[PDB]
Design a protein around this nucleic acid. Structure first.
Lengths: 121, 154, 211, 147
RNA sequence: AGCACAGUCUUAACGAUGGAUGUCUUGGUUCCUACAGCGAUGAAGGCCGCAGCAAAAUGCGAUACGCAAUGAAAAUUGCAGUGACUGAAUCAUCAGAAUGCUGAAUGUAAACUACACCAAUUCCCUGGGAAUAGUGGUACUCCUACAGAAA
RNA sequence: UUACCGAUACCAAGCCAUAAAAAGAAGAAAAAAUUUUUUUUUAGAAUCUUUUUAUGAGUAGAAAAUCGUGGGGUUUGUGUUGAAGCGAAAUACGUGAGUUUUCGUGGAACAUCUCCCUAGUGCAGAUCUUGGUGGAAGUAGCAACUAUUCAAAUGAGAACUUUGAAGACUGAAGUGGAGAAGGGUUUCUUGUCAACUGUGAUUGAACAAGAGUUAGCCGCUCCUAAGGGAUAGCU
RNA sequence: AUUUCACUCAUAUUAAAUAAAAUAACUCCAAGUGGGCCAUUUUUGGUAAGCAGAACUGGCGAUGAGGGAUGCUCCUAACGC
RNA sequence: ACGGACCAAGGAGUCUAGCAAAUGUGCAAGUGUAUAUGAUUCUUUAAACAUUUUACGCAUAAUUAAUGUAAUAUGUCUAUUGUAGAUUUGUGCCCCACUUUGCAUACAAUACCGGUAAGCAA
RNA sequence: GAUGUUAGGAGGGCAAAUCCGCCGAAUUUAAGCAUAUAAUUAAGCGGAAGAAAAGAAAAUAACUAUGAUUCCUUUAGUAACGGCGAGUGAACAAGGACCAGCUCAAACGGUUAAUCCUUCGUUUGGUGCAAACCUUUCGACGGAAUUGUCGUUGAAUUAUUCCAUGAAUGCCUUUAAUUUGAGCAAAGUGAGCAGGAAUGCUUCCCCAUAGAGGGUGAAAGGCCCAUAGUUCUUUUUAAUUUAUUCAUUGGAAUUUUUCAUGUCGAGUCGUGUUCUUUGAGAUUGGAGCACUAAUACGUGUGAUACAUUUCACAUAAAGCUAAAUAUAUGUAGGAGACCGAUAGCAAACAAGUACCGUGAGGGAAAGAUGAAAUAGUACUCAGGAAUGAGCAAUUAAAUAGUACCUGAAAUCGUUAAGAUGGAACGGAUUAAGAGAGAAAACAAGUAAAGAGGGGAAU
């Protein structure tokens, strides 16, 4: 608002959102975390990753849970283990859920995550 | 304003007597749909408007300073009569006096929660309600020109 | 043309759209130069950014009575103030070598103005708390405590500004003290009639003085 | 302001208010002041008589500051000083106002009007009119020449 | 199981053709602000190439849709394969490295991948082994110093 | 000599508008039931209200009052329980531009007449511009180069693909070989028919995937001509 | 000749008649127009012309309605529903 | 007589400069704050706000080619004179005739200012 | 002089919106047209910067005078120019923005070129990991230069303060500003309805120094990015830790006695003539040719040619200079009472692309399924195949099936109804049919039963 350096123009930031590079799309991938995680980590929202576990609270499957299996920042979508949808041809695929429609409940650690959690701390 | 050379940036060929076609200029050449088409003009496709908009239009106006202070005084006086402010659109049926004045402690504290609380306690709960639910997307073409919402004044 | 109208003379017969310009950026540049001068004044270190100018009469007969800021004081004005110009440019004093003081009133109206400006000088040390007496008529320098106690008051800009001149239009005299017999119109006519021969006389006077 | 224009009220009238036989041609009588002395001569003689020709010498460069001379009449002399000053001047016969019109911006004093009878006024003006002098001296004042 | 004459014209319902209307907009336009050159240390521009499957556009230059380094930080995926379980997958930054033939083009030419001359050159270990028809330089004008011949 | 017919003119009346005029800044009427209820109204907006009289063609032209459109402030609203738009319509309103509703379609926005501001603001034409579509019309026409026929194969399908037979032509200055400019893969093999091959087509110079051009002796490269560019100068 | 004082010439139908005579008078700004034609009467040139050129008035233009079968100009008559 | 086969969309008195008239608005012998200036104004803010006790524009005076000259005239804070004329005052709170005032304006009469003639002219 | 395949360097070309020179029209206006106007413009040639150019009076004024240039308001559509026709048209003063002034030419050092450059090695300390870069001066050599560089802007003679140092000692702290990059950043994913899916409607809570925007299956302050607000980091720039000494070495600047009244831009100014330019007019500037000066007591201006002569100002013919100023170019940001795919740039897209012309050049058309194709049509039947159909199939929807949002009109098909003797439509008036219609086009109230909704009464 008061910062005239950056713009509030509809097209100017719609272009930014739709052509953002993968690094900025990763930050856009952020989603709210549950109450227990909020108390535990003192934060409010983290980006998601492939070995993460999440609860969706919006859409046709607003009650299901499950760990995510794969994400891709081109379509701005994430996929959890047990939201498989049958296709016309006769095979199972994954429904895309926008990260804004889900809340996390668990997170994992690795040689990268052991430092991302220290960063967030 | 429109670009200065809008529509008129091509060749002026108007071979139009004996060709059994209108005397309007046509673009020259061949191999394209553009060749032979009606060139720049008031009525032609891609021919530029008849009076292109110019940046030297009288955008602003000179208002006499005396005019302006007269108008400011008149509006201040009009703000001090209950009927005029009621008719303008403010719901003030619950406030006591129309030239409303508050003590200088209004400036002291800086939480908008307590600001709206002071407003409702003074008796403008319905007014702030009108303000909060007057927010909605505006009609027409303006909402994609960074002019989305339309808000009632309070 | 038709009807009763002023005959047009609109000098608009050439390619004028190329020359038309509109000052959309008027207040923008006013702001930009405001901040430019504020930044300059903030950065220079408390010294005023204005420079003192002489208060001098306007030329011609249209503006005989008015006075305005001029381009620098004269060499004799600076000498009367006790400053060489070549060292008085240092204290924010404008100087020009083109003006000449043609009247004692012009001299004496700028001398005390220069003295008033000199009465406010506060010199600064250069060599890390090694204040000195100064050179070239510049006033003396002050030490640590002095600069620490003067560097934070209100600066004076009225002297820098054009000198307000109050001239008593409303004034009166005793009725018995009037020269009732004067003939102003006859005096003007006589002077205009006799202008040529007085020019003759001055011509012959100076021809005599050439000897 | 377009909706208030006269052309808008005759959108479907074909001729746009410019006649059906005469039509609206572009410059049917010439451009500018073309027809002076030839076919717009009647208009020129009826509305701008002395247009053609030239009279008088040439002032090669004017320098209007030389001849600049704002004027004031005698009947306005009592108007410059304020009402309180005028009141305190009119009552006492031993004191007379001295007005320097060059301060107000006037250089010559003309004698149009009427001066208040038997109030002396001293006037300091760069130039003076003969009848202005005569009125001032008759009323009992005196004219001061200044430069 | 049978019945309507046909054609032409009109009306209504549903369709066909067509792409108007309305609603959309990573586009344009105008104004304001700020910074401002590039090139023989080879510019702009033009060719020619470069991906596993690769035409164009975009990007890049034989290190060729990208190398190194720095920040973020694990995917590329159409299949393939590639990766950590962070200099590794991908973005962003981009200072190091590299930057084909040309082009002011500048050894001579040009609808030539032609022809010269001078150092034959370059790499390897820190005096011995190879590739080689294979690497650099050589325009015109001018400036400052140098040289050896002249009247 | 009578009667009759016969105007948007004339006469009487009603209504609209224009002009003018007369006047104007707050109290109960009736009906239906049966004292009591019910029914309607009970008014006062000055460019306004009531009433009265006269008048009413109109090109060029001029004015006023209205009706719409994009956008902007103010006010206050409609939208997924379907907005805009669109087709048909309405015991609908106006005198009329138009306004408002119904049904269907539509699937995401829309209006503000409270008042005002703003303009790229209203189409039947301009041999208007762009795009789309007609009657003409299954019509004109598919006419140079003498000429084709039988049988078979392939194929879903054969007058115009292939094979064999026949009859013929180019015919010594050839639809024959090599030719250069120009073209640039049209060349070859295999496969294939959405479009093209103005008829058909399984063919093809079309489409698709691969492949194909080998020089000391053939040419360029070398020389010089008509000539071109450049150097020295000189303008 | 001017001015001032007297008197007074219908002014209660109006210094003759009649008059939807103030729908007047004046000023400003401005559009269109500035090719005309026809009819009666008069008339010039011409053999004459639906010819050329003029005067008065009225029409057509700019205007329909009833009639003259028909007709831009003739007769009646001009126009809100 | 010319344009028009049909339909959809687009399609033409506008913008700026300068002048006048008309009307509205504000102030008024003044009026306009020009460029600029300051301000804890500074998404909105490129607009609003303000101008330490003679800038200029137009008007307030005209006339003459021009040196230049420049509007009753000091008898008096009654401010030129007529004929009509709006309004006001009474006498015979509303009809009438007489005086009382005399807006605007029209038609004139006068003076006075600039210029030109004519007379005089130190 | 020539020459270098000598050593070290530069110029060339691209790019132009603003800027600096040259060259240079015509269309047009004058209602014709020739001077004039267009225009000192368009086109052409050349040359730089972030600004350029102009700039320090051979100025203006005539006044109580001003004091480089540039730009803004005004002078002013004025003075003036002009078939005095059409038209053209300054300057001074004034109010402001900005404001910095300077050095070459002669004097003197001749009891010492006191100057300048090249090359080759050493060191004086430093911020960078590094690469590099800022500073460092002992020199030596080679030259250039007296056909003139530097010192000096007078010199010597008295009276005061500065400017550097080498070395050692102690010292790199702390506030404001400005600025880049980084992080942190409140409140609901509560019922319920209708939903394919809320961000919608009711209803219950809040946060706001955040109710700017964008995204999320529909309209979100409380779902996400973020936006308010803050915390570090970065460049410098105002204030701010620390001076002490030893030392002679030099220089400078301010003020008293004398000289000497010096120097001061030559084929230049100026004049004549011709052309051009200008408002400049018995010539405003420039240019060509001819003639060709004076020496400060001069000559140059003072807007009418000339002679004689006063006054005022300035001191040409050499040069540098930041500011305020302009930017239809490029790049990067931010906005709008702008356009919403025949509009807006020619180009919302694979656009200066496809394509056309030998060439210079000319130059388009073309956006939209769906929330999600990580839902793009599976299966069966008939067909050679295209395709069509389904009792089958994704979706909320397939008459959203890729010529895919909506889907007008022109034009055409089907079905139904009606009319039909060389036009068809139409105006006015009904009549017959076929559609749709109850809001005036009858029935308020009354008593009962059945479902509800409210208001008052505790």
């Amino acid at each position: 608002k008061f910062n005239k350096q950056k713009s509030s123009s509809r097209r100017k930031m719609r272009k930014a959102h739709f052509t953002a590079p993968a690094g900025l799309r990763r930050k856009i991938m952020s989603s709210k975390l549950s109450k227990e995680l909020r108390l535990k980590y003192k934060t409010r929202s983290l980006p998601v990753r492939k070995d993460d576990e999440v609860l969706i609270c919006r859409g046709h499957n607003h009650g299901r849970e499950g760990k995510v299996v794969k994400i891709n920042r081109k379509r701005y979508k994430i996929y959890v283990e047990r939201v498989t949808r049958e296709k016309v041809n006769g095979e199972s695929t994954f429904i895309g859920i926008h990260p804004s429609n889900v809340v996390l409940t668990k997170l994992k650690v690795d040689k990268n995550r052991k430092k991302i959690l220290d960063r967030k701390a | 304003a429109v670009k200065l050379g809008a529509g008129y940036e091509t060749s002026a060929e108007s071979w139009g007597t004996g060709r059994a076609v209108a005397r309007i200029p046509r673009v020259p050449g061949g191999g394209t749909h553009r060749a032979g088409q009606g060139a720049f003009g008031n009525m032609c496709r891609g021919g530029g408007m008849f009076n292109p908009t110019k940046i030297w239009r009288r955008w602003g106006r000179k208002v006499n300073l005396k005019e302006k202070r007269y108008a400011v005084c008149s509006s201040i006086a009009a703000s001090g009569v209950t009927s005029l402010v009621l008719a303008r659109g403010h719901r003030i049926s619950h406030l006591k006096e129309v030239p409303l004045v508050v003590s200088n402690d209004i400036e002291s504290l800086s939480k908008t929660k307590e600001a709206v609380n002071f407003l409702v306690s003074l008796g403008l709960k319905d007014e702030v309600n009108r303000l909060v639910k007057s927010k909605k997307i505006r009609a027409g073409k303006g909402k994609m020109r960074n002019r989305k919402y339309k808000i009632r004044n309070g | 043309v038709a009807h009763n109208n002023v005959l047009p003379n609109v000098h608009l017969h050439k390619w004028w759209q190329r020359h038309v310009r509109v000052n959309f950026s008027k207040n923008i540049k006013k702001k930009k130069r405001r901040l430019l001068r504020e930044k300059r004044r903030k950065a220079n270190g408390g010294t005023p950014i204005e420079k003192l100018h002489p208060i001098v009469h306007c030329p011609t007969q249209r503006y005989n009575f008015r006075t305005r800021l001029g381009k620098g004081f004269t060499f004799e004005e600076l000498k009367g103030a006790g400053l060489t110009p070549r060292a008085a440019q240092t204290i924010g004093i404008c100087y020009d070598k083109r003006r000449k003081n043609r009247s004692e009133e012009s001299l004496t109206k700028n001398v005390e103005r220069l003295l008033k400006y000199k009465n406010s000088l506060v010199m600064i040390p250069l060599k890390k708390n090694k204040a000195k007496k100064g050179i070239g008529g510049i006033p003396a320098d002050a030490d640590k405590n002095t600069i620490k106690e003067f560097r934070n008051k209100k600066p004076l800009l009225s002297i820098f500004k054009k000198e307000k001149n109050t001239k008593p239009f409303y004034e009166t005299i005793e009725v018995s003290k009037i020269d009732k017999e004067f003939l102003a119109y006859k005096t003007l006519r006589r002077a205009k009639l006799a202008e040529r021969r007085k020019n003759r006389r001055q011509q012959k006077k100076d021809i005599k003085f050439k000897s | 302001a377009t909706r208030f224009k006269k052309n808008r009220k005759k959108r479907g009238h074909v001729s746009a208010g410019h006649g059906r036989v005469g039509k609206h041609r572009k410059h049917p009588g010439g451009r500018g002041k073309a027809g002076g002395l030839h076919h717009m001569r009647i208009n020129f003689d009826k509305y701008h008589p002395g247009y053609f020709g030239k009279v008088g010498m040439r002032h090669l460069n004017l320098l209007k500051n030389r001849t600049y001379c704002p004027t004031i009449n005698v009947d306005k002399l009592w108007g410059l000083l304020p009402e309180e000053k005028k009141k305190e001047f009119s009552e006492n016969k031993d004191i007379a106002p001295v007005i320097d019109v060059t301060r107000k911006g006037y250089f010559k004093v003309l004698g149009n009007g009427k001066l208040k009878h038997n109030q002396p006024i001293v006037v300091k003006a760069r130039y003076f009119s003969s009848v202005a002098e005569k009125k001032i001296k008759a009323v009992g004042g005196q004219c001061i020449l200044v430069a």
